[model samples]
Structures are given as structure tokens and as C-alpha cells.
Target: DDEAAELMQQVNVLKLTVEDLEKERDFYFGKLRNIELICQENEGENDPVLQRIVDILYATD
Candidate 1:
């Protein structure tokens, strides 16, 4: 019974951790989306600086 209680507690803590991590991910994704929009707005002229930023933003690593 005691071990079961401890495992339940661990699971609750892990759930909280997952929620916090998802929130953090969404926060950064919002920032990245804003940057992407800004880049798109100025994409007509083919600006070199914007190109570099786009490349880095979409990089796999």
C-alpha cells in the first residue's frame, strides 16, 4: 500500500512537469511564430538578413 501511494505521488509530479514543459514550449513557439510572420512581411525584396534568419529558424539542429 505504501509503495502504491508513492508511485501515485510520482505520477502526479510527472503530470505537473509535463504541463509546465508544454507551457514553456508554447511560449517559445509563439515567439518563433511572430518572428516568422515578420520575416514573411518583408520577404518581397529578398533581404539577405531575413534570408539568414529564415535559414537559422528552420534549421534541423
Candidate 2:
């Protein structure tokens, strides 16, 4: 019973960690979407520059 209780505790901790990570990941993704929207809004005729920057950012990986 003691070992089972410890294992359940570990599982609960992992679940909390996963939930926190998912929230953090979504926050970052939303930030990136905002940046892209701003870039699009400011890129009327000079879209080439925006495209270049996006390309470079993607190429970093």
C-alpha cells in the first residue's frame, strides 16, 4: 500500500508538470502568432523584408 501510494504521488506530479508545460507552450505559440500578425500588418509594400526575416528565423533550425 505504501509503494502504491508513492507511485500515485509521482503520477500526480507528472500530470501537473505536463499541464504546466502545455500552458507555457501555448503562451509562447500565441506570442509567435502575435509577432507574425504585427509583421503582416506593417508589411504593405515591403513584404520582401518581412519574408526574409521569417525565412531566416525558420532556417535557424
Candidate 3:
């Protein structure tokens, strides 16, 4: 009975933590993808300066 109750308590907290992690993961990826899209937009790929800066941003992680 004690072990079962402990696991149920753990699941309640663990599920919330998992949800928070998933949300932040989505948020972080969204922020990263936008700048990348901006840099890659319409010849941005050919622009050396933009590419360099984007590379730097990419290297930040």
C-alpha cells in the first residue's frame, strides 16, 4: 500500500514535469527555427554575412 501510494504521487509530479519540458522544447525550437528561416529566405543562403552570423548563432548551442 505504501509503495503504490508513492508511485501514484510520483506520477502526478512526473507528468507535470514532462509537460513543462515538452512545452519548453517546442518553444526553444520555434525560436531557433525562425531566425534560421529568416537567414535562409530568398538568397539569404548566398549572403556571406548572414550565413556567417547564422553559423555563429547555430554554434552557440
| TM-score winner | 1
lDDT of 3 by residue, 19-46 (tens): 9999999999898888777877845348
lDDT of 3: 0.84
- Candidate 1 Cα RMSD after full superposition onto the native fold (Å): 1.0
By lDDT rank, best first, the candidates go 1, 3, 2
Model 1 gets an lDDT of 0.96
Between candidates 2 and 3, which one is better according to lDDT? 3
Note the Cα lDDT for every prediction shown: 0.96, 0.84, 0.84
Candidate 2's error at 47, in angstroms?
A: 6.9
Q: Can you write out model 2's per-residue Cα lDDT over 1-61, one digit (the tens) per residue?
A: 8999999999999999999999999999898788777777887767788888667546755
What's the TM-score of every candidate structure? 0.89, 0.69, 0.73
Model 1 clashing residue pairs (backbone): none
Error of 1 at 4 (Å): 0.8
* Better-scoring candidate (TM-score), 2 or 3: 3
lDDT of 1 at 45: 81
